[PDB]
Amino acid sequence: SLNWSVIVPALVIVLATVVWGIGFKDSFTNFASSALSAVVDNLGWAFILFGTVFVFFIVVIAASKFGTIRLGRIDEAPEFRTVSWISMMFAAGMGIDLMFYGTTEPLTFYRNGVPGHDEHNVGVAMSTTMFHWTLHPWAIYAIVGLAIAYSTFRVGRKQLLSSAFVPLIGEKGAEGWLGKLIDILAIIATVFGTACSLGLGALQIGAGLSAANDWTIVGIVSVLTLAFIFSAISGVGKGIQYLSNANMVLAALLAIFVFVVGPTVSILNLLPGSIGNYLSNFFQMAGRTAMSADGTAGEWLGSWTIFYWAWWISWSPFVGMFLARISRGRSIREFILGVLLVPAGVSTVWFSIFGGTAIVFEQNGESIWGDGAAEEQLFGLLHALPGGQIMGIIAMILLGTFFITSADSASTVMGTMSQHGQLEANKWVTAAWGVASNLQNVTIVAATPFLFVVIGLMFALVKDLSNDVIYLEYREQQRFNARLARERRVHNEHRKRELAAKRR
Amino acid sequence: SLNWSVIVPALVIVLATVVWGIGFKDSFTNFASSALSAVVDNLGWAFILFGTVFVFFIVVIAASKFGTIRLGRIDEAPEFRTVSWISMMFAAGMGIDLMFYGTTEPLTFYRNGVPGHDEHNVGVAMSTTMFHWTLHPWAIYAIVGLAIAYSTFRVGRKQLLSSAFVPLIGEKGAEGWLGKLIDILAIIATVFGTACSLGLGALQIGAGLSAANIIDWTIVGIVSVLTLAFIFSAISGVGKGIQYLSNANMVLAALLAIFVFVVGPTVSILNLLPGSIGNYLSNFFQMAGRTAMSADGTAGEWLGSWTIFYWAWWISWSPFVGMFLARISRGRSIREFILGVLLVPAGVSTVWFSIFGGTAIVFEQNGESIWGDGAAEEQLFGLLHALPGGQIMGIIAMILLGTFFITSADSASTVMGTMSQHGQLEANKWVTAAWGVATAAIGLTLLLSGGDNALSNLQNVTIVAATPFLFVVIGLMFALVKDLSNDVIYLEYREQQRFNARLARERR
Amino acid sequence: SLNWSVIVPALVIVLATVVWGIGFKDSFTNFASSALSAVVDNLGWAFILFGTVFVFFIVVIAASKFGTIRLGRIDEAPEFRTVSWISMMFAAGMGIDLMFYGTTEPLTFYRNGVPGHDEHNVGVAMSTTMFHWTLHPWAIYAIVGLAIAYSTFRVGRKQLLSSAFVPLIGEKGAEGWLGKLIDILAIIATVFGTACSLGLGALQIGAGLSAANIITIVGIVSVLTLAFIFSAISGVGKGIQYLSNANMVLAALLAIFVFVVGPTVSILNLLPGSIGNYLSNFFQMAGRTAMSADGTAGEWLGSWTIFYWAWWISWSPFVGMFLARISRGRSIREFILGVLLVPAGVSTVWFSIFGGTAIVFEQNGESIWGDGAAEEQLFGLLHALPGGQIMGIIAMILLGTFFITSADSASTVMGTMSQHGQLEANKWVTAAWGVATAVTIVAATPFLFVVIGLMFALVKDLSNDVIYLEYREQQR
């Protein structure tokens, strides 16, 4: 079936803005761009304060006994073997976001330097770029991951997101004020959440084709690729799977390419250097406040750290929904360590090669900084290697596949929440959604409340699992063990007492 | 049955400070406060090291299996609800001291900077203040709280610090050479601890009088001796139920936190919550190792005035917080009661210095600057006066430091009575007041001797009377670890895992 | 009993090495030195990366189940108790390194600064020194130590490094490419490793005797200490047990006299000081990849932290043995921390006292750095105190003490890794290989990796211990 109670408020606002951005007061939309500023500096803290709390809590829980609990009907066989499951995360744990931002972020920090430190600090350059792209971002997922996952596969209920809040607003009666609203606010941040990498993919080509053959060629390019959304899911059988390995071959290749063509020793060296520093500056990073230092970091932080936080939150639905799947039969722990450590530790080695070389080239004077342009750097530093174009091609096509990976999946997810949450593949809705610095701004305002949704989600999560039979058993059993062991002891002290007073 | 071997000895020292200091010579009391440099110079390292030790110490017993042991009889349960129990903690975690150092503290740090830190350094400045007022201060309180809550509750001894050394000391009637001694080291330290709070709390008030009237050296003599007269109307002639101002405190303190939160730079104040917890955590070890060798050996002096004082002050109070937290505590687990103590009080102190002290910083950045001529006593009235209707608030402020003194004193003089008479839960109304005035007398006695640097002489004696007790609380770990090893539950468990090992060994 | 298939490939290189660096070839064994740089630069990442994991590793080992099971026969009464055991471990905690380097290093770092900082800072100059001398050099031992012992005392497999690789390789199947290669590079390692701990001592004696008999003679000393490496175990027994104990009392005395005569507070104001800092600066120093800062520390890393790891890596077969040998019946847990808590305390305080005093003297204008050679400095601050020359005499002796206990025992590991990893070996082999030392970084360059696999052979192997094998062979 379809949820035409969640769909209808959906597009009325989706397009209310869409048409509102292309038409009417065309520049009226740039009042919103100056409107986030209310949210960024009034809530920045909220984002940061809770953004970190998100990292500690997920980890305590995995570590906690809650983690042994398995995700699906009691006693279920993993979807993939413990070395076949490994390959699965990559399918979600990468995208177009890594390439445009991934080779410019360490550089841009090694260049300008981050608030609180001097320029040309390779160390911070590595510590601040991972802050955003490793431990922190992924934990915003695994929260929503687990609540969504535990909601559906274990308890055995609906693939709708607001569902995971039934242990707070009750169950089956949280459909109104709170509930439908969540789904609505869910679909929206998934339409905007997508284009933020979709329309972006066109922009990276709008300045990407310069490697071969500008601000209006995007419309022609957008259709070149979008015409392939209706073929991959609508016309072609199956979803993803095939592309997941494509990214390893394509990504793994250009990466091992660079790791062996570019001097390896420096990138390899910065391998522990990357982690080491991360750890040393992670707490200090998490206390960064517009108030610090001297209260002049606000516009840096709104620009970078608050920019990603807000953004990840406004993208955690797709990625909590997508990660839930193919995590059935996997337990809590193995799934939390799953979504962290590895997706975390891939990104890290990725900024280690793109970042290390990108920098080592400024260490000498072969700057890759293409007039301060995110799309220019990527290639500016591989056409500085043999076959710069021979790979630069595979990079284009790498940002091509990624266009449909995100789209494909995203639509899977969004289309899934409009059907009453059922998994079955809905060709019809997957295709319809497909079509549906002002690139970095529309996402974050759109699901501002979401931050409070994942905040409260901690409880709705911890409250609900805590009633899981296995864990319910474990704590019941503790009481019996605790008191039984009481009887055994109170008696002795009456036996060893009566016996004692017998020696008189 | 008042312990007189214990009661008189504590007083012989109480009287000596007051009699020697103001009535006769005066100039000579400041000689013993040359001894203070003595303590910091060559016993300085110890306060610094065992300070950070107490914090680890406590977390690992909480972390340790002992954590599961229940205060009281086996599988006992807490007397009141988690929320109530906690609810007790916020009151425990506020009084005259935050008032005094709420604002000058982190400001003095942004204003002047910290050794190893360039001045105007928000993150550091804040994290140093958090340093003094969170886990390290509260590790100590729990160290002593546990010891007390455990001896009376579990092994059922007398509510006396000595009765918590019994595992390590004879015994056959604990408190021989030792123990009488120990309790004596409690009373005294408990007097000068509360003294400062009574002390700097007083002159905070004389200062505050400026907001309403204008208008003094004799005026501080009046400030205390009046509310000190009103510790008697408070305990001498109790009416209805004695509990009552504890909340009468909380509300005012609430109007102030709320008042300034919104009026003052709110988003900043909010920005300090994530910000300050983080610098803290991040700066937790770097400041842990700040002795008088960093920086270049120049932090020696800075430690003396601040950092060391928190160490001496927290210690010389642990006899009071320690019984308080203990008394409330019965019914918790060591693990539940540790984590509770470090985390719960700490929320408040972190929130407090962010708002009260965190506007003083913001201001100092717009040039407003509440520095008030460099005196910290007046800084609290000052920053408020920079806000709409801050004058009415200054008034409440005084009346707040009023209520605090009586409430600061009664709770002390009860504990101090309780340990002056063989640790009776039942508290003699007549004895308490005695510890009321005696303590008030030394608190006042410290203000008057000093003149313009009245603050200085206060923190240097309370540092000396503390130095002894610090060893007490160090030893108190050792008793505490031997007491927890012989406990039923930890012992009975080691018989079951060695068994859950032996059972499997012979079947295979 | 003498294994002559492992002695040959090693005995040939050793006979050859002393020579090819002699007879007018003395220059071409010098350009050969610079080929060390080659390693530090492409295996630079190698140490600095794992050096730090070993620590976390053992911790994460001592932390988990494996910890509880006793080393050796199921639930055995150990060969000591806590109050006594505590003495035997100390035997390793003190040495010849901790002579010149304790005073000089903390002093150096204070004076010139270490990369990524300013100079004259006391915190960094401690935490940096402690860092090179704490957990980092004791995990690279604990892994060697814990593995060997478990191969023989638990499992009972002969006491020889390759034997610990059984898990990863095969039961009796290692013999081929991996193992024969091990046993040989676990000699080269034992020779040179200790050779860079004695080589500094053959000199520092002549340098330190320029504090006694002001002012060729360097080589006369090598014998006057070596001449009592054989008459110390060959005739009468008990040197390993008797010397280390005495020597600790010497070093203790030394330390204590300086501690008291030297300002007491400063040293004693630096216990919290070093510890607070060592924790604080732990992860930053650890990730001190040369890439930092600005690409600069390449060289600083090469002079000490990285060179530091190699030598330490070189030390794993000889050192890793004894700490395993010493322990029977005592759970790995009471051993991992055993060899982690003690090392930091003996080291920390030791640097604290001597290194810290040095920093104190520099601050008061009383510099003892003069000229600028490591070997001259210890005696510098020494003679700067009452009874200086005198304590200086025992400090002299200290140099030669343990050197004998570390030469007679550097010898023992060889004698036992010669005769099929036999605990007890014939006397002639141990002493004969005691005159061998009578390049450190590349001596052990491959042996790093030998540790890493040793880390997998220690985890994979346990998971085939009885507790984990029984559950394994059950429902699963």
Ligand SMILES: C[N+](C)(C)CCO
């Ligand atoms: C709140 N107490 C009075 C218990 C002490 C805190 O300053």
